[PDB]
Design a protein around this ligand. Structure first.
Ligand code: HEM
Ligand code: HEM
Ligand SMILES: CCCCCCCCCCCCCC(=O)O
Ligand SMILES: CCCCCCCCCCCCCC(=O)O
Ligand SMILES: *[C@@H]1O[C@H](CO)[C@@H](O)[C@H](O)[C@H]1NC(C)=O
Ligand SMILES: *[C@@H]1O[C@H](CO)[C@@H](O)[C@H](O)[C@H]1NC(C)=O
Ligand SMILES: *[C@@H]1O[C@H](CO)[C@@H](O)[C@H](O)[C@H]1NC(C)=O
Ligand SMILES: *[C@@H]1O[C@H](CO)[C@@H](O)[C@H](O)[C@H]1NC(C)=O
Ligand SMILES: *[C@@H]1O[C@H](CO)[C@@H](O)[C@H](O)[C@H]1NC(C)=O
Ligand SMILES: [Mg+2]
Ligand SMILES: [Mg+2]
Lengths: 240, 240
């Protein structure tokens, strides 16, 4: 029963907190989360993701409580807190630079080129294109970042994020694991719901059972291999 | 400014959730946390630890948000949820069995014998006795549990727990890193504040700066070495 017309996109001001996640950033830019990006709890994320995207509480509780670790507060974050490297934030992002060699927070068009140019000859991104992008992004980090971290955990998180953009920005059947380029590009480049472009919130719930096989197929097609430590240890709080 | 007369010890009833932590169990048994042990948030833990023990928000926010990972709820746990192996719960506990070979949840008198018998000829437990206990408990797990997990992280958590019993149950100067056996034994065996025995809440705040040197000294005296891959990865949620 959400009224999207009561949730206009507004550009964030210079002091509105935004993070490395286009999903949460977009929700804030439409006021599903606080536009200032501050004082955000897991219940707020659960509600916002449901209302905005029809993403269910299973994934948002699991991911949300991990995200909470990035702040110094008892039960809230600022979106910018999520840039904390090695909690969720990882190398070989789709649209951000690796923290060791650049800006791990803001959208970067040069990084995004790989995704933007994927699935040549189609007007959608899909599971095979998403896998290719992941392969190529990881190769770039291995080439250029002397502090690169690549573990089973980061690889899984990366495939989860690719599954998110394929499903949440779909043309309405998220099971298909494909999304119009026009919608995904707006999502990343503007952190806006592409409403005027024709996007509508999925009428199918997006939950762990739906995402699981998509995640696994993306991983499988990405020709991923362990390269190093492979210990899936997360950073448990800031300033440790 | 805490009225302990308004916080009597009551034995947990059959539907009351209790976990592997004597600290939180004791707070629940005195109603500083809900006596039913359910729907417990990090803000509730922060307040309860302050009121009951003069433990500060630094450690309780950090540990509390990690503890939140153990439930399926957005921002609360039941105390029993904390038994989830490999989040905080670990092998070589002071008063519980290793999950692979026994009950990792309930107080176990046979396990507790090692701590109870430590520091012979004194009426206190102290840093050297706590270190000996940790050495002996870990040795027991290495002997009897083929699946033992023993890492920098579990070792730190274990010394933190020893530091907690030495400080929170002290005779009122937690800096000393020694606690009356009569107080610590009641804490573990009954999950009760030993008020009739003469214990009083510390007038000195117990925070990370106070605990840190105690933790480090316990580790130093314990003749510790890691096991296997020494991977500090935590379990990020239940049913994975
Ligand atoms: C529990 C809620 C969420 C948390 C805590 C969260 C956290 C994060 C974090 C920290 C990152 C940065 C990882 C990195 O690239 O280094 C990220 C990336 C991403 N998230 Fe979220 N996220 C959440 C929900 C969502 C939702 C609902 C979507 C919906 C589409 C989404 C889509 C993405 C995408 C596509 C990326 C990849 C960005 C890139 O690689 O450049 N997230 N998330
Ligand atoms: C408030 C002050 C606290 C005190 C004094 C305290 C004390 C202790 C002690 C002494 C143990 C060791 C029990 C043993 O080895 O048999 C322990 C274990 C544990 N504590 Fe706490 N604790 C406190 C707060 C917390 C908090 C905030 C959390 C998480 C929300 C937590 C979670 C646990 C867990 C999961 C264990 C089990 C680890 C294991 O032995 O395997 N504790 N605690
Ligand atoms: C088991 C994979 C489910 C997808 C979870 C990805 C969300 C990333 C945040 C971290 C929370 C759990 C991570 C994980 O188990 O993959
Ligand atoms: C210097 C901090 C030591 C105290 C940590 C107590 C353990 C809390 C549970 C896990 C949360 C952080 C992990 C850790 O650094 O020990
Ligand atoms: C943050 O949110 C809580 C819960 O709604 C509220 O009590 C508090 O006043 C808020 N603080 C700020 C600075 O907005
Ligand atoms: C993705 O789209 C390309 C181009 O249409 C196609 O070759 C490929 O088979 C598709 N992959 C999947 C998984 O649908
Ligand atoms: C990063 O890699 C460089 C070059 O190998 C090394 O000096 C450094 O210790 C590594 N760690 C970090 C994060 O600085
Ligand atoms: C409180 O915790 C219970 C599990 O003990 C859970 O079912 C519930 O969602 C939480 N809040 C309530 C009562 O809705
Ligand atoms: C602990 O107490 C014993 C027995 O009195 C004593 O020998 C030992 O030195 C004490 N250790 C510390 C750290 O005070
Ligand atoms: Mg990144
Ligand atoms: Mg244990």
């Amino acid at each position: 029963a959400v009224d999207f017309s009561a949730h206009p996109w507004k550009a964030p001001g210079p002091n509105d907190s935004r993070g490395p996640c286009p999903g949460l950033n977009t929700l804030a830019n439409h006021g599903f989360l606080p536009r200032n990006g501050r004082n955000i709890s897991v219940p707020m994320i659960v509600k916002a993701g449901f209302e905005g995207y029809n993403v269910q509480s299973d994934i948002l509780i699991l991911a949300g409580k991990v995200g909470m670790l990035t702040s110094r507060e008892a039960d809230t974050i600022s979106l910018e807190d999520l840039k904390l490297h090695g909690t969720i934030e990882h190398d070989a992002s789709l649209s951000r630079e690796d923290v060791a060699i650049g800006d791990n927070l803001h959208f970067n068009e040069a990084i995004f080129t790989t995704l933007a140019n994927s699935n040549p000859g189609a007007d959608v991104y899909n599971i095979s294109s998403a896998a290719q992008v992941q392969h190529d992004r990881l190769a770039d980090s291995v080439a250029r970042n002397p502090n690169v971290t690549n573990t089973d955990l980061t690889a899984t998180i990366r495939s989860s994020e690719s599954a998110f953009y394929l499903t949440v920005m779909s043309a309405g059947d998220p099971l298909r694991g494909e999304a119009p380029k026009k919608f995904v590009n707006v999502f990343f480049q503007e952190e806006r719901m592409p409403i005027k472009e024709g996007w509508k919130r999925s009428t199918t719930p997006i939950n762990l059972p739906l995402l699981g096989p998509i995640i696994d197929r993306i991983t499988e097609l990405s020709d991923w291999k362990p390269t190093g430590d492979n210990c899936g240890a997360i950073v448990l709080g800031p300033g440790l």
